[PDB]
Amino acid sequence: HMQFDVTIEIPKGQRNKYEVDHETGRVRLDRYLYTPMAYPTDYGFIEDTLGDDGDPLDALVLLPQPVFPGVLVAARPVGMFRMVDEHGGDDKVLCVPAGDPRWDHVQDIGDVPAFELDAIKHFFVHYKDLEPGKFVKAADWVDRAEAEAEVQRSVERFKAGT
Amino acid sequence: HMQFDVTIEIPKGQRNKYEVDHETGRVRLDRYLYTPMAYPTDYGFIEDTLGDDGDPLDALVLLPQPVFPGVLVAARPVGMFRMVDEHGGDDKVLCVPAGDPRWDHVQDIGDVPAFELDAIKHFFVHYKDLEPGKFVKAADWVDRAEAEAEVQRSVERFKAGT
Amino acid sequence: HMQFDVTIEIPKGQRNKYEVDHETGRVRLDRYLYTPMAYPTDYGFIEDTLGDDGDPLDALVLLPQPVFPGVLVAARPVGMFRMVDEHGGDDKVLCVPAGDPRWDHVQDIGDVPAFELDAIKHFFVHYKDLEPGKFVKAADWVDRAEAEAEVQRSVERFKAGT
Amino acid sequence: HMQFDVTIEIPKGQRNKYEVDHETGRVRLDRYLYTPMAYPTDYGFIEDTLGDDGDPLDALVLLPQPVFPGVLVAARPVGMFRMVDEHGGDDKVLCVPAGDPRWDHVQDIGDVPAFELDAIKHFFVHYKDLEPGKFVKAADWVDRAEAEAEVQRSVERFKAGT
Amino acid sequence: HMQFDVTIEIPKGQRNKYEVDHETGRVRLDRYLYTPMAYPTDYGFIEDTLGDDGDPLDALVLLPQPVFPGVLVAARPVGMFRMVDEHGGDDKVLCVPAGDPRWDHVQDIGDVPAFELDAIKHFFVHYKDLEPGKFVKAADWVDRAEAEAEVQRSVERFKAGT
Amino acid sequence: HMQFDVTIEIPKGQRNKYEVDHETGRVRLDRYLYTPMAYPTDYGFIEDTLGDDGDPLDALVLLPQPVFPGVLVAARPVGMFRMVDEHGGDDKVLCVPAGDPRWDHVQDIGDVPAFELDAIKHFFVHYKDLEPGKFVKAADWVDRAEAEAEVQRSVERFKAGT
Ligand SMILES: [K+]
Ligand SMILES: [K+]
Ligand SMILES: [K+]
Ligand SMILES: [K+]
Ligand SMILES: [K+]
Ligand SMILES: [K+]
Ligand SMILES: [K+]
Ligand SMILES: [K+]
Ligand SMILES: [K+]
Ligand SMILES: [K+]
Ligand SMILES: [K+]
Ligand SMILES: [K+]
């Protein structure tokens, strides 16, 4: 039942860390990563959400082929990666394409292979290893119901801000 | 004499079916194709046109190297692929870059090799084979004069809507 | 238990049809396909096998990332695509990487999603549509036990020829 | 101290000459180059600048990995390529990523290897060789202080126009 | 009637100059080019030929999609680029795929557009501009009959050497 | 003065771990890495060397553009990464292209930026994090003189084995 639009900022396999400027919609290169790592899934954020830090809620989308920075994908949540960085919580909703029967076997976090979840976790735990003052901690996976609650509160924050 | 701007949605060689949202201009992933096929030419639509279905008129552009989703190319028509899908007519104007003398040998539909036209037709006839309820029929090639008439009526519809 | 080496001739996503010359080991471009299609999986043949036609037994390998023409991959069979072309039988063994626990969930043909099997079938049924005199018919999927029997007989033929 | 945003129009290695339309922000294919050449660095323009010809000031950005057309990169100048074409001056500011310590060794034009500067010059001197009526002349490298003066005047022109 | 096998050393679009070692068959990186140029066509040599300098006769092959270094392509000649470098003659036979009806319109040098021939010439005239002591001169196009004579003499030299 | 040939097995940016079989020369896929990491430089081994474990001595080559698996590059050493894995020593010689003046500024280990050396180290320290029983320890950089001594002993071992 829940679905939303994700804007992918960074396709799977990138060492260039792109970000959308949420005031203008422009794509920016934030930085080239300092570690020999690459985003493990397409990565971006959920449109029309607002986290407590004032940015949209982050999203990871499982896909058969990556998209390009800036592309929208209708998606549904199947779990969430809870984590903190140097600025506090920075959780990521894990998603699959909405309306696509090739993904109907993936409904909740236990439907994603551990090898894939462990590689995602490894990326976020280590990608900033060589950036002074930056880190990732308190990182773990939670289920779809918890992810949906996090999306819902972030939708509420967005609507309160309009 | 006739030329127009085409926005390419899908570069040649893609199995990701991108589409521009005509209200916002954003690029969206519609779907990953269900068949092991790839767009045979760069594919998109003609800016400032409106077909009867309320979307712009589709376009195919022959190029020496593909572009990226969302890129504009000034183009001129050399023929049209007439076809119907599950929603009725969904014709495509075949184009070459405007103002480029490397394409001056291509003025009308007979100037495009049959192998290329037959591969284009094959794509549209088969790409939805594995999507239930979707199909393509009544598919054939027509000449530049017919293509230009179709563009002109779609320009008229666009202007009437403003 | 059964495993073998596959030489991949054609990575997933190719419209260039490469083939290894079995006398010299050289990679050759056989042809650019005439249809707007691309190999649905990495494709090649099983080393040290001989089919009745005097060529090695063909193989399809499911992978998380494609390889390059000429690369060896240790693989194990999970089923087979039976088909005939203009020259008679030309079956393909479907395989996954051997010794890799990320594939342990795939043991037999029912463990591969229908969407993937149907796309593979579609490729072989249609890729020669635009080549005169060439075709593919009598095409269907069989299980691992049948695939292993076909591999074994082809290993026997190879050894008899030495 | 000086930094600015560059919009990259053309990634390193491209023979497709993309340009941003400065009225709309859309990316357009200007042309496929007529020579067998490719942009030697990521290439674009400095946001919120206006040259005498009414377009923003051009920029070259040294990067470890190219970006995509339309991407913003915060950059700082280290020199400038002075040149004229068929329409007069068309200088390019040479830049490195701002705020990135991997580039702190590059502060002025003498910090860029001659092989790289000579390849950049070669590109602009020759890329239009096969376009009638188009050329590049009076081409040479100047230092950061001269580049910064050119940026500053172009920022002043931009602000006067608002 | 004449055809031969070409080994492609360098795909279209490369700035890495690969070469096959003719004693071992191994692919080597000769050098990264010093100019911001890229091979305009797939480039290599004709198997079982020997030029006067003791290397096989060079070949350019027109293709719809490039191959990989080391790949064989059955080809037929349609003309030749005569040129000299710092070591004397170093002519290139221009070819199209043999046995492929998509190329039947290309029989001789006048069937290749001037824009393509001029870009090929430009590449060889300029690619060594920034290499001291290296150059290309006396460069021009000749017809298929002249190309075939050059191939034939080089086949004769090869056979005399066995 | 010292130079040698390196066969690159794995281009920069790969998550596919290729290896050459030293008995046959064939390229094999060893495995897809289990971590979201990619080789930080082109990686392979020095031809005509033998380490104590019976395999050639490993090499890392700094390049402006990656090569393809199996390609030879004439190289010279500028330092070495000393490390141990689950099987003992598995050091890597760090190299630049031989005979190429664009690399003449890199003569010893202090001429390579720390950011690059630290990223290389990070790769080897972490790439097997998610493989049970596999690890990398005792990892550090040493100078050219030490690297050359290691190459020389491995050349001696190779020659003793013939
Ligand atoms: K966030
Ligand atoms: K850190
Ligand atoms: K339409
Ligand atoms: K259908
Ligand atoms: K076969
Ligand atoms: K057919
Ligand atoms: K300008
Ligand atoms: K010119
Ligand atoms: K030659
Ligand atoms: K020169
Ligand atoms: K080793
Ligand atoms: K481990």
- Answer whether E67's CB lies under 8 Å from E42's CB: yes
Cβ–Cβ below 8 Å for B101 and E115 = yes
Residue B28 with chain A: CB contacts under 8 Å: 71-74
d(CA D30, CA D20): 9
In this structure, which long-range contacts are made by residues F135-140, counting pairs with CB atoms below 8 Å and at least 24 apart in sequence? F135/F85, F135/F86, F136/F83, F136/F84, F136/F85, F136/F90, F137/F83, F137/F84, F137/F85, F138/F82, F138/F83, F138/F84, F139/F81, F139/F82, F139/F83, F139/F84, F140/F81, F140/F82, F140/F83
Q: Which residues pair with A44 in a beta bridge?
A: A8, A59
CA distances from B96 to B51, B91, B93, B151 (A): 21, 17, 10, 15
- Environment class of E99 (CB within 10 Å of its CB; exposed 0-12, middle 13-18, buried 19+): exposed
User: Which of D30, D42, D90, D100 is flagged as catalytic?
Assistant: D90
Contact: chain D with chain E (3+ CB pairs below 8 Å): yes
**In chain C, residues 50-109 whose CB comes closer than 8 Å to chain B:** none
What is the H or E stretch that residue C10 is in? strand C4-10
Mapped onto helix, strand or coil, the DSSP state of residue C22 is coil
CB-based contact, A125 to chain F, within 8 Å: no
User: Chain D closest CA to E22's CA: distance in Å?
Assistant: 28
Q: Is residue B90 annotated as involved in ligand binding?
A: yes
Containing E152, the helix (H) or strand (E) segment is: helix E144-160
Coil, strand or helix: which one is D21? Answer: coil
- The answer to whether the CB of E39 falls within 8 A of the CB of D36 is yes
Tokens 């005498």 locate to D52
Q: A interface mutation test: which of D7, D71, D103 has the most A CBs within 10 A?
A: D71
CA distance D51 to D155: 9
Instruction: Give the number of other Cβ atoms within 10 Å of residue E86's Cβ.
Output: 12
What chains are in contact with A, requiring at least 3 Cβ pairs below 8 Å?
B, C, D, F
User: What residues have their beta carbon closer than 5 A to ion ligand 3?
Assistant: B 55, 58, 90
Going by C-alpha positions, the residue among A133, A135, A127 that lies closest to residue A32 is A127
SS3 E3: coil
Task: Indicate the SS3 state at residue E145.
Answer: helix
Q: Which among A102, A113, A115 has the least Cβ separation from residue C115?
A: A102
What ligand is nearest to the CA atom of residue F129? 12
Measured in angstroms, the CA of A47 and the nearest CA of chain D are apart by 20
Domain spans in chain E, listed from the N-terminal domain onward: 1-162
Write the DSSP string, D84-127. EETTEE--EEEEEETT-GGGTT--SGGGS-HHHHHHHHHHHHHT
Instruction: Say if residues A78 and A141 touch (Cβ distance below 8 Å).
Output: no
- Is F34 annotated as a binding-site member? no
How close D136 comes to chain A (CA, Å)? Answer: 31
- Structurally, at CATH architecture level, domain F1-162 sits in Alpha-Beta Complex (3.90)
Which of B124, B126, B127, B131 is the best substitution to test chain C (most C C-beta atoms within 10 A)?
Answer: B126
Four-CA torsion F8, F12, F15, F21, nearest 10 degrees: 0
Query: Of the candidates F64, F70, F72, which has its C-beta nearest E32's C-beta?
Result: F64
Residues F98, F74: contact at Cβ < 8 Å?
yes
User: What is the spatial distance between Cα D96 and Cα D108, in angstroms, rounded to a whole number?
Assistant: 10
HEC profile of chain F: CCCEEEEEEECCCCCEEEEECCCCCCEEEEEECCCCECCCCEEEEECCCCCCCCCCCEEEECCCCCCCCCCEEEEEEEEEEEEEECCEECCEEEEEECCCHHHCCCCCHHHCCHHHHHHHHHHHHHCCCCCCCCCEEEEEEEEHHHHHHHHHHHHHHHHHCC
* CA F8 to ligand 11 center in whole angstroms: 13
Whether B113 and chain E come into contact, CB under 8 Å, resolves to yes
**Residue A116 host element (H or E):** helix A114-126
Q: Is D28 annotated as a binding residue?
A: no
Tell me the C-alpha distance between F32 and C102, whole Å: 10
Structural determination approach: X-ray
* 3-state DSSP assignment of residue E55: coil
Q: Cα dist. A130→A40, F40, F137 in Å? A: 18, 14, 18
Q: CB of C88 within 8 A of CB of C19?
A: no
Q: Do the beta carbons of residue C140 and residue C125 sit within 8 Å?
A: no
B99 φ, ψ (degrees, to nearest 5): 75, 15
Which residues are paired to C95 by β-bridges? C61, C77
**Distance of alpha carbon B77 from alpha carbon B140, whole angstroms:** 16
Helix segments in C1-143, DSSP class H: 114-126
CB neighbours of residue E87 within 10 Å: 8
User: β-strand B92-97 against B58-61: which pairing, if any?
Assistant: parallel
The annotation status of E146 as a binding-site residue, yes or no, is no
Instruction: Give F162's contacts (C-beta < 8 A, 6+ positions apart).
Output: none
Picking from A29, A33, A39, A134 by the largest number of D CB atoms within 10 A of its own CB, the best residue to mutate is A29
Whether residue B43 contacts residue B58, with contact meaning beta carbons closer than 8 Å, is answered with: yes
User: Which residues contact residue E40 at a Cβ distance below 8 angstroms, ignoring those fewer than 6 apart?
Assistant: D36, E12, E60, E116, E119, E120, E122, E123
CA atoms of D28 and D117, how far apart (whole Å): 28
Query: Is A73–B15 a contact, with Cβ atoms under 8 angstroms apart?
Result: no
| Residue carrying the six token digits 């998509």 | E102
Interface partners of chain F (CB pairs < 8 Å, 3 or more) are A, C, D, E
Three-state DSSP at E80 gives: strand
F18 is in an annotated binding site: no
**Is B31 labelled as part of a ligand binding site?**
yes
DSSP chain B: ---EEEEEEE-TT--EEEEE-TTT--EEEEEE-SSSB--SSEEEEETT---TTSSPPEEEE--SS---TT-EEEEEEEEEEEEEETTEE--EEEEEETT-GGGTT--SGGGS-HHHHHHHHHHHHHTTTTSTT--EEEEEEEEHHHHHHHHHHHHHHHHHT-
Q: Is A touching F (3+ C-beta pairs, cut-off 8 A)?
A: yes
Q: Is D140 a catalytic residue?
A: no
Q: Does the CB of B115 have a partner CB in chain E at under 8 Å?
A: yes
Whether B39 contacts chain C with CB within 8 A:
yes
Tell me the pairing of strands B92-97 and C58-61. unpaired
Question: Which DSSP state fits E102?
Answer: G
Cα torsion at F145, F147, F150, F156 (round to 10°)? -80
Angle at B41 between CA B35 and CA B47, to 5 degrees: 110
Considering every ligand atom, which ligand is closest to the CA of A127?
Answer: 2
Task: Out of B102, B105, B115, name the one closest to residue E102 (CB).
Answer: B115
CA E33 and chain centroid, separation: 17
